[PDB]
């Protein structure tokens, strides 16, 4: 298939300080690397697939995503008390056959599947059998707002797909 996969590992020492490590692969080729603390994260395209204006917008959007991602983790901790240190893994992307696209967004915590995005209804589901205040609250937050439902679905089904179509 024609695919863009994105992987984000987030190392939280505490609610306020996170180290990001991640990357993206297009057609099985490493294309982007993400690394560093939340206050000065480095994001590069390894090959200049996007021109500067397009790349600047993409970088701005990624940074906005990280701000939202970190804000959500802080909120869950604030309301339900997370155990630190912890690592979060987000694995997401889109896959185009040789019109329709398969998209996915899976979240794991400390290496165990936690929640994932079901794009059919733009809803997050529990990926664990373990019941907890944390999973219920996180799902409630993720499912309460357009930004984490339909806006994320647009990113996967439109932004990601058009990126694969333009650059593969
Ligand atoms: C494409 C071009 C190439 C990309 C290069 C990538 C570099 C490598 C790293 C990959 C990082 C993934 C980035 C995803 C960006 C998604 C994005 O921009 O979404 C925007 C809004 O989504 C949101 O705001 C959704 C927030 C989702 C958070 C999910 C995490 C759930 C778990 C958090 C709490 C866990 C608590 C228990 C520990 C809309 O983007 P737009 O610009 O189209 O608008
Ligand atoms: C994620 O895993 C880390 C260990 O890698 C957990 O941290 C441990 O938490 C227990 C209980 O609070 C402490 O006794 C240990 O000292 C901690 N380890 C370290 C290295 O500090 C953390 O609680 C886990 N977080 C989850 C499961 O959400
Ligand atoms: C990212 O930032 C790291 C931390 O910055 C340091 O701490 C802050 C609080 C300020 O005192 C600042 O002046 C310090 O430099 C750096 O250690 C690291 O090198 C930075 N990464 C890059 C790529 O610049």
Residue numbers in the entry: 8 to 105, 108 to 177
What does the paper behind this entry write?
EPCR is a transmembrane MHC class I-like glycoprotein primarily abundant in the vasculature of large vessels, but present in numerous cell types. Since its identification, EPCR has been mainly known for its role in accelerating the generation of the anticoagulant activated protein C (APC) and favoring its cytoprotective properties. Structurally, EPCR shares a notable degree of homology with the CD1 family of receptors, including the presence of a central and extended hydrophobic cavity suitable for lipid antigens, flanked by two alpha helices lying on top of a beta sheet. The presence of a lipid bound to EPCR is key for its biological functions.
For this, we performed a wide crystallization screen and obtained EPCR crystals in varied conditions, which ultimately led to solution of the structure in three different space groups. Crystals grown in other conditions yielded EPCR structures in two novel space groups, C2221 and P212121, containing 2 and 4 molecules of EPCR per asymmetric unit, respectively. Structural alignment against EPCR in space group P3121 yielded root mean square deviations of 0.459 and 0.400 for EPCR molecules in space groups C2221 and P212121. EPCR in P3121 and P212121 space groups present strong and continuous Fobs-Fcalc difference maps that suggest a prevalent diacyl molecule but a more ambiguous head group moiety. Fitting of a diacyl phospholipid scaffold (lacking the outermost head group) satisfied the overall shape of the map, albeit with some degree of uncertainty for the orientation of the carbonyl groups. In order to assess the later, we mapped the atomic displacement parameters (ADPs, also known as B-factors) in all space groups in which EPCR was crystallized. The P3121 space group yield the highest B-factors for all atoms, while those EPCR-lipid complexes present in the P212121 crystal structure showed the most rigid atom positions, as suggested by the lower B-factor values. Amongst all EPCR molecules in the three space groups obtained, the dimensions of the pockets range from ~ 1280 to ~ 1615 Å3, where both values were found in two of the four EPCR molecules present in the P212121 space group asymmetric unit.
